[PDB]
Symmetry: C6
Subunit: 90 residues, 6 copies
Protein backbone atom coordinates (compact mmCIF):
# COMPACT_ATOMS: atom_id res chain seq x y z
CA UNK A 1 0.00 0.00 0.00
CA UNK A 2 1.05 3.56 -0.76
CA UNK A 3 2.16 5.75 2.14
CA UNK A 4 1.10 9.36 2.71
CA UNK A 5 2.99 11.62 5.09
CA UNK A 6 2.32 15.12 6.39
CA UNK A 7 4.70 16.83 8.85
CA UNK A 8 3.48 19.97 10.61
CA UNK A 9 4.72 22.38 13.28
CA UNK A 10 2.60 21.51 16.26
CA UNK A 11 0.07 18.87 17.25
CA UNK A 12 -3.14 20.74 16.35
CA UNK A 13 -2.14 21.31 12.72
CA UNK A 14 -1.21 17.61 12.53
CA UNK A 15 -4.57 16.49 13.93
CA UNK A 16 -6.23 18.73 11.37
CA UNK A 17 -4.05 17.28 8.59
CA UNK A 18 -4.96 13.78 9.76
CA UNK A 19 -8.69 14.56 9.95
CA UNK A 20 -8.68 16.04 6.46
CA UNK A 21 -6.71 13.09 5.05
CA UNK A 22 -9.14 10.50 6.39
CA UNK A 23 -12.12 12.59 5.23
CA UNK A 24 -10.83 13.04 1.69
CA UNK A 25 -10.24 9.45 0.63
CA UNK A 26 -10.23 5.81 1.67
CA UNK A 27 -6.97 5.86 3.64
CA UNK A 28 -6.18 4.59 7.14
CA UNK A 29 -4.17 6.46 9.76
CA UNK A 30 -1.47 3.95 10.72
CA UNK A 31 1.39 6.09 12.00
CA UNK A 32 1.93 9.06 14.24
CA UNK A 33 5.31 10.56 15.04
CA UNK A 34 6.81 13.39 17.03
CA UNK A 35 10.54 13.99 16.64
CA UNK A 36 10.87 17.19 18.68
CA UNK A 37 11.31 20.84 17.78
CA UNK A 38 7.53 20.67 17.38
CA UNK A 39 7.60 18.50 14.23
CA UNK A 40 4.61 16.15 14.22
CA UNK A 41 3.88 13.66 11.40
CA UNK A 42 0.73 11.76 10.44
CA UNK A 43 1.02 8.66 8.24
CA UNK A 44 -1.77 7.07 6.19
CA UNK A 45 -1.94 3.99 3.95
CA UNK A 46 -4.19 3.14 1.02
CA UNK A 47 -4.20 2.83 -2.74
CA UNK A 48 -1.96 5.39 -4.41
CA UNK A 49 -4.90 7.34 -5.82
CA UNK A 50 -6.52 7.61 -2.39
CA UNK A 51 -3.24 8.58 -0.67
CA UNK A 52 -2.54 11.34 -3.22
CA UNK A 53 -6.05 12.76 -2.77
CA UNK A 54 -5.71 12.46 1.02
CA UNK A 55 -2.33 14.21 1.27
CA UNK A 56 -3.42 17.03 -1.06
CA UNK A 57 -6.49 17.65 1.10
CA UNK A 58 -4.62 17.27 4.39
CA UNK A 59 -1.95 19.79 3.35
CA UNK A 60 -4.52 22.37 2.25
CA UNK A 61 -6.51 22.05 5.48
CA UNK A 62 -3.52 22.06 7.84
CA UNK A 63 -2.05 25.11 6.09
CA UNK A 64 -5.21 27.03 7.01
CA UNK A 65 -4.38 26.86 10.74
CA UNK A 66 -0.66 26.11 10.92
CA UNK A 67 2.62 25.44 9.16
CA UNK A 68 3.04 22.33 7.01
CA UNK A 69 6.76 21.51 7.02
CA UNK A 70 6.79 18.55 4.61
CA UNK A 71 4.46 16.19 2.78
CA UNK A 72 5.10 13.08 0.76
CA UNK A 73 3.46 10.21 -1.10
CA UNK A 74 5.45 7.00 -1.61
CA UNK A 75 3.54 4.84 -4.10
CA UNK A 76 5.52 1.67 -3.26
CA UNK A 77 7.54 1.96 -0.04
CA UNK A 78 10.57 -0.28 0.03
CA UNK A 79 10.19 -3.00 2.61
CA UNK A 80 12.87 -1.55 4.92
CA UNK A 81 11.24 1.82 5.60
CA UNK A 82 8.33 -0.09 7.10
CA UNK A 83 10.73 -0.54 10.03
CA UNK A 84 10.46 3.22 10.59
CA UNK A 85 6.70 3.30 9.97
CA UNK A 86 6.04 0.48 12.44
CA UNK A 87 8.25 2.33 14.94
CA UNK A 88 5.49 4.98 14.94
CA UNK A 89 2.49 2.62 14.95
CA UNK A 90 -0.72 3.72 16.68
CA UNK B 1 -18.66 14.45 20.41
CA UNK B 2 -16.90 17.50 18.97
CA UNK B 3 -13.23 18.10 19.77
CA UNK B 4 -11.71 21.40 20.88
CA UNK B 5 -7.96 21.98 20.81
CA UNK B 6 -5.76 24.81 22.06
CA UNK B 7 -1.97 24.76 21.58
CA UNK B 8 0.13 27.26 23.52
CA UNK B 9 3.79 28.12 24.05
CA UNK B 10 4.46 26.81 27.50
CA UNK B 11 2.63 24.80 30.14
CA UNK B 12 1.21 27.70 32.17
CA UNK B 13 -0.63 29.25 29.21
CA UNK B 14 -2.03 25.79 28.41
CA UNK B 15 -3.30 25.28 31.97
CA UNK B 16 -4.95 28.69 31.77
CA UNK B 17 -6.49 27.76 28.41
CA UNK B 18 -7.78 24.49 29.88
CA UNK B 19 -9.19 26.22 32.97
CA UNK B 20 -10.98 28.81 30.85
CA UNK B 21 -12.38 26.17 28.47
CA UNK B 22 -13.87 24.08 31.27
CA UNK B 23 -15.24 27.20 33.00
CA UNK B 24 -16.90 28.51 29.83
CA UNK B 25 -19.05 25.55 28.79
CA UNK B 26 -20.05 21.95 29.39
CA UNK B 27 -16.88 20.35 28.00
CA UNK B 28 -14.55 17.73 29.48
CA UNK B 29 -10.76 17.84 29.43
CA UNK B 30 -9.80 14.51 27.81
CA UNK B 31 -6.38 15.09 26.22
CA UNK B 32 -3.12 16.78 27.08
CA UNK B 33 -0.09 16.83 24.81
CA UNK B 34 3.43 18.18 24.68
CA UNK B 35 5.38 17.85 21.41
CA UNK B 36 8.50 19.89 22.18
CA UNK B 37 9.67 23.36 21.22
CA UNK B 38 7.43 24.31 24.15
CA UNK B 39 4.18 23.50 22.30
CA UNK B 40 1.54 22.26 24.75
CA UNK B 41 -2.02 21.25 23.77
CA UNK B 42 -5.24 20.85 25.75
CA UNK B 43 -8.09 18.80 24.24
CA UNK B 44 -11.77 18.98 25.25
CA UNK B 45 -14.88 17.11 24.11
CA UNK B 46 -18.53 18.07 24.16
CA UNK B 47 -21.35 19.18 21.90
CA UNK B 48 -20.18 21.47 19.11
CA UNK B 49 -21.89 24.51 20.63
CA UNK B 50 -20.22 23.94 23.99
CA UNK B 51 -16.81 23.19 22.44
CA UNK B 52 -16.92 26.34 20.29
CA UNK B 53 -17.78 28.50 23.31
CA UNK B 54 -15.05 26.77 25.32
CA UNK B 55 -12.29 27.21 22.73
CA UNK B 56 -13.20 30.87 22.13
CA UNK B 57 -12.95 31.53 25.87
CA UNK B 58 -9.78 29.49 26.34
CA UNK B 59 -7.99 31.34 23.55
CA UNK B 60 -9.08 34.70 24.94
CA UNK B 61 -7.88 33.89 28.48
CA UNK B 62 -4.62 32.18 27.50
CA UNK B 63 -3.64 35.06 25.21
CA UNK B 64 -3.65 37.31 28.30
CA UNK B 65 -0.63 35.53 29.85
CA UNK B 66 1.01 33.78 26.91
CA UNK B 67 1.16 32.85 23.26
CA UNK B 68 -1.61 30.78 21.71
CA UNK B 69 -0.01 29.02 18.77
CA UNK B 70 -3.16 27.45 17.27
CA UNK B 71 -6.72 26.52 18.11
CA UNK B 72 -9.28 24.30 16.48
CA UNK B 73 -12.80 22.91 16.72
CA UNK B 74 -13.61 19.66 14.89
CA UNK B 75 -17.39 19.21 15.01
CA UNK B 76 -17.24 15.56 13.91
CA UNK B 77 -13.79 13.98 14.25
CA UNK B 78 -13.18 11.03 11.99
CA UNK B 79 -12.86 7.77 13.92
CA UNK B 80 -9.13 7.48 13.10
CA UNK B 81 -8.27 10.78 14.81
CA UNK B 82 -9.28 9.31 18.17
CA UNK B 83 -6.15 7.16 17.87
CA UNK B 84 -4.08 10.33 18.26
CA UNK B 85 -6.42 11.76 20.91
CA UNK B 86 -6.32 8.58 23.00
CA UNK B 87 -2.54 8.61 22.65
CA UNK B 88 -2.67 11.81 24.73
CA UNK B 89 -5.28 10.56 27.20
CA UNK B 90 -5.09 11.88 30.76
CA UNK C 1 -6.96 25.40 47.12
CA UNK C 2 -5.58 28.11 44.85
CA UNK C 3 -2.88 27.19 42.35
CA UNK C 4 0.23 29.26 41.70
CA UNK C 5 2.42 28.65 38.65
CA UNK C 6 5.77 30.04 37.55
CA UNK C 7 7.38 28.96 34.28
CA UNK C 8 11.04 29.83 33.71
CA UNK C 9 13.70 29.35 31.07
CA UNK C 10 15.91 26.79 32.69
CA UNK C 11 15.90 24.61 35.78
CA UNK C 12 18.00 26.89 38.02
CA UNK C 13 15.68 29.89 37.64
CA UNK C 14 12.77 27.53 38.40
CA UNK C 15 14.43 26.21 41.58
CA UNK C 16 14.96 29.81 42.66
CA UNK C 17 11.31 30.58 41.89
CA UNK C 18 10.20 27.56 43.94
CA UNK C 19 12.46 28.41 46.86
CA UNK C 20 11.23 32.00 46.99
CA UNK C 21 7.57 30.91 46.68
CA UNK C 22 7.81 28.52 49.62
CA UNK C 23 9.74 31.07 51.73
CA UNK C 24 7.28 33.87 51.02
CA UNK C 25 4.03 32.32 52.23
CA UNK C 26 2.34 29.18 53.50
CA UNK C 27 2.19 27.32 50.17
CA UNK C 28 3.20 23.76 49.29
CA UNK C 29 5.20 22.71 46.23
CA UNK C 30 3.00 20.06 44.59
CA UNK C 31 3.94 20.13 40.90
CA UNK C 32 7.01 20.31 38.72
CA UNK C 33 6.93 20.29 34.95
CA UNK C 34 9.34 20.42 32.06
CA UNK C 35 7.88 20.76 28.56
CA UNK C 36 10.99 21.34 26.44
CA UNK C 37 12.50 24.39 24.81
CA UNK C 38 13.91 24.79 28.32
CA UNK C 39 10.55 25.77 29.86
CA UNK C 40 10.36 24.58 33.48
CA UNK C 41 7.30 25.16 35.70
CA UNK C 42 6.84 25.03 39.49
CA UNK C 43 3.33 24.64 40.93
CA UNK C 44 2.26 25.56 44.47
CA UNK C 45 -1.03 25.25 46.35
CA UNK C 46 -2.45 27.17 49.29
CA UNK C 47 -5.03 29.80 50.14
CA UNK C 48 -5.36 32.48 47.47
CA UNK C 49 -3.73 35.15 49.63
CA UNK C 50 -0.70 32.96 50.31
CA UNK C 51 -0.42 31.85 46.66
CA UNK C 52 -0.55 35.45 45.40
CA UNK C 53 2.20 36.51 47.81
CA UNK C 54 4.22 33.42 46.87
CA UNK C 55 4.00 33.96 43.11
CA UNK C 56 4.85 37.67 43.39
CA UNK C 57 7.98 36.80 45.39
CA UNK C 58 8.99 33.85 43.22
CA UNK C 59 8.74 35.95 40.05
CA UNK C 60 10.78 38.77 41.60
CA UNK C 61 13.53 36.42 42.82
CA UNK C 62 13.71 34.31 39.65
CA UNK C 63 13.90 37.37 37.38
CA UNK C 64 17.17 38.40 39.04
CA UNK C 65 18.96 35.26 37.79
CA UNK C 66 16.94 34.16 34.78
CA UNK C 67 13.97 34.62 32.51
CA UNK C 68 10.44 34.22 33.85
CA UNK C 69 8.35 33.15 30.88
CA UNK C 70 4.93 33.24 32.58
CA UNK C 71 3.25 33.23 35.95
CA UNK C 72 -0.31 32.64 37.04
CA UNK C 73 -2.59 32.41 40.06
CA UNK C 74 -5.83 30.44 39.71
CA UNK C 75 -7.88 31.14 42.82
CA UNK C 76 -10.30 28.26 42.18
CA UNK C 77 -9.03 25.77 39.62
CA UNK C 78 -11.70 23.77 37.84
CA UNK C 79 -11.64 20.11 38.86
CA UNK C 80 -10.52 19.07 35.39
CA UNK C 81 -7.18 20.88 35.36
CA UNK C 82 -6.15 18.82 38.38
CA UNK C 83 -5.73 16.03 35.81
CA UNK C 84 -2.87 18.08 34.35
CA UNK C 85 -1.49 19.09 37.75
CA UNK C 86 -1.50 15.48 38.97
CA UNK C 87 0.32 14.57 35.76
CA UNK C 88 3.21 16.67 37.12
CA UNK C 89 3.01 15.64 40.78
CA UNK C 90 6.32 15.65 42.64
CA UNK D 1 30.27 -3.70 6.68
CA UNK D 2 30.33 -0.08 5.57
CA UNK D 3 27.96 2.36 7.26
CA UNK D 4 25.95 5.08 5.51
CA UNK D 5 24.28 7.88 7.44
CA UNK D 6 21.88 10.63 6.46
CA UNK D 7 20.65 13.23 8.96
CA UNK D 8 17.65 15.35 8.00
CA UNK D 9 15.42 18.03 9.50
CA UNK D 10 12.20 16.19 10.11
CA UNK D 11 10.90 12.64 9.93
CA UNK D 12 9.42 12.81 6.42
CA UNK D 13 12.67 13.92 4.76
CA UNK D 14 14.41 11.07 6.61
CA UNK D 15 11.87 8.48 5.44
CA UNK D 16 12.44 9.71 1.89
CA UNK D 17 16.21 9.46 2.36
CA UNK D 18 15.85 5.91 3.70
CA UNK D 19 13.52 4.88 0.88
CA UNK D 20 15.89 6.28 -1.74
CA UNK D 21 18.92 4.60 -0.12
CA UNK D 22 17.32 1.16 -0.06
CA UNK D 23 16.05 1.55 -3.65
CA UNK D 24 19.42 2.69 -5.00
CA UNK D 25 21.70 -0.17 -3.91
CA UNK D 26 22.01 -3.38 -1.92
CA UNK D 27 22.01 -1.83 1.56
CA UNK D 28 19.96 -2.64 4.66
CA UNK D 29 18.32 -0.11 6.96
CA UNK D 30 19.71 -1.03 10.39
CA UNK D 31 19.56 2.16 12.47
CA UNK D 32 17.20 5.02 13.12
CA UNK D 33 17.94 7.92 15.41
CA UNK D 34 16.26 11.09 16.61
CA UNK D 35 18.32 13.46 18.77
CA UNK D 36 16.02 16.49 18.99
CA UNK D 37 15.94 19.88 17.34
CA UNK D 38 14.17 17.85 14.65
CA UNK D 39 17.33 15.97 13.61
CA UNK D 40 16.51 12.47 12.34
CA UNK D 41 19.06 9.96 11.05
CA UNK D 42 18.78 6.85 8.89
CA UNK D 43 21.63 4.31 8.98
CA UNK D 44 22.33 1.64 6.35
CA UNK D 45 24.96 -1.08 6.02
CA UNK D 46 26.40 -2.87 3.00
CA UNK D 47 29.51 -3.06 0.87
CA UNK D 48 31.27 0.27 0.50
CA UNK D 49 30.24 0.62 -3.15
CA UNK D 50 26.58 -0.01 -2.38
CA UNK D 51 26.63 2.28 0.66
CA UNK D 52 28.19 5.12 -1.34
CA UNK D 53 25.63 4.76 -4.14
CA UNK D 54 22.83 4.62 -1.54
CA UNK D 55 23.90 7.74 0.38
CA UNK D 56 24.39 9.82 -2.79
CA UNK D 57 20.87 8.88 -3.97
CA UNK D 58 19.26 9.31 -0.55
CA UNK D 59 20.80 12.77 -0.17
CA UNK D 60 19.62 13.84 -3.62
CA UNK D 61 16.07 12.60 -3.04
CA UNK D 62 15.71 13.96 0.51
CA UNK D 63 16.99 17.38 -0.58
CA UNK D 64 14.03 17.65 -2.98
CA UNK D 65 11.53 17.75 -0.09
CA UNK D 66 13.55 18.82 2.95
CA UNK D 67 16.86 19.77 4.51
CA UNK D 68 19.72 17.28 4.67
CA UNK D 69 21.87 18.44 7.58
CA UNK D 70 24.75 15.98 7.14
CA UNK D 71 25.63 12.73 5.43
CA UNK D 72 28.52 10.32 5.78
CA UNK D 73 29.96 7.04 4.56
CA UNK D 74 32.29 5.12 6.89
CA UNK D 75 33.94 2.36 4.85
CA UNK D 76 35.31 0.52 7.90
CA UNK D 77 33.66 1.58 11.16
CA UNK D 78 35.75 0.99 14.23
CA UNK D 79 34.26 -1.64 16.51
CA UNK D 80 33.44 0.98 19.16
CA UNK D 81 30.99 3.03 17.10
CA UNK D 82 28.79 -0.03 16.71
CA UNK D 83 27.92 0.62 20.36
CA UNK D 84 26.18 3.79 19.15
CA UNK D 85 24.68 2.11 16.09
CA UNK D 86 23.25 -0.71 18.21
CA UNK D 87 21.80 1.96 20.51
CA UNK D 88 19.68 3.03 17.52
CA UNK D 89 18.83 -0.42 16.18
CA UNK D 90 15.48 -0.68 14.37
CA UNK D 91 13.49 -3.76 13.37
CA UNK E 1 23.24 21.88 53.62
CA UNK E 2 23.80 24.63 51.06
CA UNK E 3 22.95 23.96 47.41
CA UNK E 4 25.07 25.08 44.48
CA UNK E 5 23.75 25.04 40.93
CA UNK E 6 25.31 25.63 37.52
CA UNK E 7 23.31 25.46 34.28
CA UNK E 8 25.22 25.31 30.99
CA UNK E 9 24.48 25.06 27.29
CA UNK E 10 25.62 21.57 26.52
CA UNK E 11 26.83 18.50 28.37
CA UNK E 12 30.59 19.06 28.07
CA UNK E 13 30.49 22.51 29.67
CA UNK E 14 28.38 21.04 32.49
CA UNK E 15 30.86 18.21 33.11
CA UNK E 16 33.65 20.77 33.24
CA UNK E 17 31.63 22.90 35.67
CA UNK E 18 31.03 19.82 37.85
CA UNK E 19 34.68 18.82 37.76
CA UNK E 20 35.79 22.32 38.72
CA UNK E 21 33.21 22.53 41.51
CA UNK E 22 34.31 19.28 43.12
CA UNK E 23 38.00 20.18 42.73
CA UNK E 24 37.57 23.63 44.28
CA UNK E 25 35.96 22.81 47.63
CA UNK E 26 34.51 20.10 49.83
CA UNK E 27 31.20 19.67 48.01
CA UNK E 28 29.40 16.56 46.79
CA UNK E 29 27.79 16.19 43.38
CA UNK E 30 24.21 15.15 44.19
CA UNK E 31 22.09 16.30 41.24
CA UNK E 32 22.16 16.29 37.47
CA UNK E 33 19.42 17.64 35.27
CA UNK E 34 18.74 18.06 31.60
CA UNK E 35 15.60 19.99 30.69
CA UNK E 36 16.05 20.21 26.92
CA UNK E 37 17.08 23.02 24.61
CA UNK E 38 20.57 21.93 25.59
CA UNK E 39 20.27 23.20 29.19
CA UNK E 40 22.22 20.95 31.56
CA UNK E 41 22.51 21.51 35.33
CA UNK E 42 24.96 20.21 37.92
CA UNK E 43 23.97 20.35 41.59
CA UNK E 44 26.34 20.16 44.57
CA UNK E 45 25.83 20.22 48.35
CA UNK E 46 28.07 21.26 51.20
CA UNK E 47 28.64 24.04 53.69
CA UNK E 48 27.84 27.49 52.35
CA UNK E 49 31.50 28.53 52.24
CA UNK E 50 32.49 25.46 50.24
CA UNK E 51 29.48 25.74 47.92
CA UNK E 52 30.16 29.42 47.18
CA UNK E 53 33.81 28.59 46.40
CA UNK E 54 32.75 25.62 44.24
CA UNK E 55 30.18 27.55 42.18
CA UNK E 56 32.61 30.45 41.62
CA UNK E 57 35.24 28.03 40.30
CA UNK E 58 32.81 25.96 38.25
CA UNK E 59 31.40 29.02 36.50
CA UNK E 60 34.86 30.36 35.61
CA UNK E 61 36.09 27.02 34.26
CA UNK E 62 32.93 26.19 32.32
CA UNK E 63 32.86 29.67 30.80
CA UNK E 64 36.25 28.92 29.25
CA UNK E 65 34.76 26.25 26.95
CA UNK E 66 31.05 27.03 26.76
CA UNK E 67 28.09 29.11 27.82
CA UNK E 68 27.04 29.27 31.47
CA UNK E 69 23.35 30.14 31.41
CA UNK E 70 22.70 30.44 35.17
CA UNK E 71 24.35 29.82 38.52
CA UNK E 72 23.00 29.97 42.02
CA UNK E 73 23.88 29.29 45.64
CA UNK E 74 21.05 28.64 48.10
CA UNK E 75 22.52 28.75 51.60
CA UNK E 76 19.44 27.17 53.21
CA UNK E 77 17.10 25.45 50.74
CA UNK E 78 13.51 25.23 51.84
CA UNK E 79 12.45 21.65 52.46
CA UNK E 80 10.15 21.62 49.44
CA UNK E 81 12.78 22.25 46.78
CA UNK E 82 14.49 19.04 47.84
CA UNK E 83 11.54 17.40 46.05
CA UNK E 84 13.01 18.85 42.85
CA UNK E 85 16.62 18.15 43.82
CA UNK E 86 15.89 14.50 44.60
CA UNK E 87 14.01 14.28 41.30
CA UNK E 88 17.41 14.83 39.65
CA UNK E 89 19.34 12.50 41.94
CA UNK E 90 22.34 10.84 40.29
CA UNK F 1 41.77 7.25 33.34
CA UNK F 2 41.70 10.51 31.40
CA UNK F 3 38.41 11.55 29.82
CA UNK F 4 37.95 12.99 26.33
CA UNK F 5 34.69 14.60 25.23
CA UNK F 6 33.42 15.90 21.92
CA UNK F 7 30.01 17.57 21.61
CA UNK F 8 28.59 18.10 18.13
CA UNK F 9 25.44 19.39 16.46
CA UNK F 10 23.76 16.25 15.23
CA UNK F 11 24.24 12.52 15.53
CA UNK F 12 26.24 11.98 12.31
CA UNK F 13 28.97 14.49 13.17
CA UNK F 14 29.23 12.81 16.59
CA UNK F 15 29.60 9.34 15.07
CA UNK F 16 32.39 10.69 12.87
CA UNK F 17 34.04 12.31 15.90
CA UNK F 18 33.78 8.99 17.75
CA UNK F 19 35.17 7.02 14.80
CA UNK F 20 38.09 9.42 14.38
CA UNK F 21 38.84 9.34 18.12
CA UNK F 22 39.04 5.56 18.32
CA UNK F 23 41.13 5.42 15.12
CA UNK F 24 43.60 8.04 16.32
CA UNK F 25 44.78 6.50 19.59
CA UNK F 26 44.31 3.77 22.17
CA UNK F 27 41.07 5.10 23.68
CA UNK F 28 37.79 3.36 24.45
CA UNK F 29 34.35 4.77 23.74
CA UNK F 30 32.57 4.60 27.11
CA UNK F 31 29.87 7.29 27.01
CA UNK F 32 27.27 8.64 24.64
CA UNK F 33 24.85 11.45 25.42
CA UNK F 34 22.39 13.77 23.74
CA UNK F 35 20.89 16.59 25.78
CA UNK F 36 18.56 18.14 23.19
CA UNK F 37 18.80 21.08 20.83
CA UNK F 38 20.76 18.58 18.75
CA UNK F 39 23.78 18.46 21.08
CA UNK F 40 25.32 14.99 20.95
CA UNK F 41 28.43 13.99 22.94
CA UNK F 42 30.92 11.15 22.60
CA UNK F 43 33.10 10.23 25.60
CA UNK F 44 36.36 8.26 25.51
CA UNK F 45 38.83 7.09 28.17
CA UNK F 46 42.53 6.27 28.03
CA UNK F 47 45.88 7.65 29.05
CA UNK F 48 46.10 11.43 28.80
CA UNK F 49 48.42 11.26 25.80
CA UNK F 50 46.08 8.98 23.86
CA UNK F 51 42.96 10.93 24.84
CA UNK F 52 44.53 14.22 23.75
CA UNK F 53 45.54 12.71 20.39
CA UNK F 54 42.04 11.23 20.02
CA UNK F 55 40.13 14.44 20.76
CA UNK F 56 42.32 16.54 18.45
CA UNK F 57 41.68 14.12 15.59
CA UNK F 58 37.99 13.68 16.38
CA UNK F 59 37.49 17.44 16.32
CA UNK F 60 39.32 17.83 13.00
CA UNK F 61 37.34 15.05 11.31
CA UNK F 62 33.92 16.06 12.69
CA UNK F 63 34.49 19.69 11.69
CA UNK F 64 34.70 18.49 8.08
CA UNK F 65 31.02 17.45 8.07
CA UNK F 66 29.39 19.38 10.91
CA UNK F 67 29.66 21.78 13.81
CA UNK F 68 31.76 20.87 16.84
CA UNK F 69 30.17 22.77 19.72
CA UNK F 70 32.65 21.83 22.49
CA UNK F 71 35.58 19.54 23.18
CA UNK F 72 37.52 18.80 26.34
CA UNK F 73 40.19 16.58 27.84
CA UNK F 74 40.10 16.01 31.60
CA UNK F 75 43.43 14.43 32.55
CA UNK F 76 42.23 13.37 36.02
CA UNK F 77 38.44 13.48 36.45
CA UNK F 78 37.22 13.93 40.00
CA UNK F 79 35.52 10.78 41.31
CA UNK F 80 32.15 12.54 41.33
CA UNK F 81 31.87 13.30 37.62
CA UNK F 82 32.02 9.59 36.88
CA UNK F 83 28.44 9.65 38.19
CA UNK F 84 27.60 11.74 35.12
CA UNK F 85 29.74 9.62 32.79
CA UNK F 86 28.15 6.37 33.99
CA UNK F 87 24.73 7.98 33.47
CA UNK F 88 25.67 7.98 29.78
CA UNK F 89 27.23 4.50 29.73
CA UNK F 90 26.76 2.47 26.55
Amino acid sequence: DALGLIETKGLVACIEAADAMCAAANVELIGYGNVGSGLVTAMVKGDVGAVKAAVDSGVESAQRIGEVVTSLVIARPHNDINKIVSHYKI
